[PDB]
């Protein structure tokens, strides 16, 4: 997951 600003759970 490349998004560091959202919890991917």
């Amino acid at each position: 997951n490349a998004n560091p600003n959202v919890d991917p759970n």
Partner: antibody
Framework: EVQLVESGGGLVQPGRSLRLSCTASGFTFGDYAMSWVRQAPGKGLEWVGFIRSKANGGRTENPASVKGRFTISRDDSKSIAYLQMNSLKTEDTAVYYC?????????????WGQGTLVTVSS | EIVLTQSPGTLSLSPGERATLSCRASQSVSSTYLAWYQQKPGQAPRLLIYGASSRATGIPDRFSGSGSGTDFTLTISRLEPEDFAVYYCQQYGSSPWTFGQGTKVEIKR
């Protein structure tokens, strides 16, 4: 004003381990994701991982070049991000920068420390 | 991984001239996930431009960016002496985050 100071670098023999520290001040450290970027001498920039904020799970991501060898953690009570570097190889010789990941939908690397040099050699 | 290819490798210009730097992505990437950085020898990189229209705080007006999909451009409308340095593009929309190989802006003679 944002300040990021890297420490823990220096000379280390191949196969040994190092832990880098990045001490942050001037902003709410716990609100931001943090990221490490390295630059081998004479070469370009390579991302080596980020860690999310506690509000976003606090988990990490890193590329395959360092996966299983490097681990990022953070201490929000001390405003410090860490880079645990295990199984070091000569190819890991680089200047290591800690960066603050910007908020919002466009998470660029808004602030960079001066960097700390890590030299892997026997 | 998305490969970022910058061109030209070195652009040779005089102070006061216009600089046009290119960054081509091997796969389509939205403009929201693209950034440009400046680095001078012996110093850390600094953020210049990110996203569609975002400019980093304290960055002068002469730096601008455009493009979408696979083709992106960084424009320095009027080169100042401190603008001669290495410029990197970066994408962070896909894992892993990747940087271009860098474009050097040198003094022409």
């Amino acid at each position: 004003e944002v300040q990021l100071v890297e420490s823990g670098g220096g000379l280390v023999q191949p196969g040994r381990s190092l832990r880098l520290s990045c001490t942050a001040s001037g902003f709410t450290f716990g609100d931001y994701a943090m990221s490490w970027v390295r630059q081998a001498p004479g070469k370009g920039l390579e991302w080596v991982g980020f860690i999310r904020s506690k509000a976003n799970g606090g988990r990490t991501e890193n590329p395959a070049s360092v996966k299983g060898r490097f681990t990022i953690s953070r201490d929000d009570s001390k405003s410090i991000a860490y880079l645990q570097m295990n199984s070091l190889k000569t190819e890991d010789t680089a200047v290591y920068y800690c960066t603050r990941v910007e908020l919002g939908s466009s998470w660029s690397l808004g602030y960079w420390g001066q960097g700390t040099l890590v030299t892997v050699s026997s | 991984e998305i490969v970022l290819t910058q061109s030209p490798g070195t652009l040779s210009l005089s102070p006061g001239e216009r600089a046009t730097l290119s960054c081509r992505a091997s796969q389509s990437v939205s403009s929201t996930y693209l950034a440009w950085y400046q680095q001078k020898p012996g110093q850390a990189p600094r953020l210049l431009i990110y996203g569609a229209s975002s400019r980093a705080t304290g960055i002068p007006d002469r730096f601008s960016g455009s493009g979408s999909g696979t083709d992106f451009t960084l424009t320095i409308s009027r080169l100042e002496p401190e603008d001669f340095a290495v410029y990197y593009c970066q994408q962070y929309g896909s894992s892993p985050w990747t940087f271009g190989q860098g474009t050097k802006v040198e003094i022409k003679r």
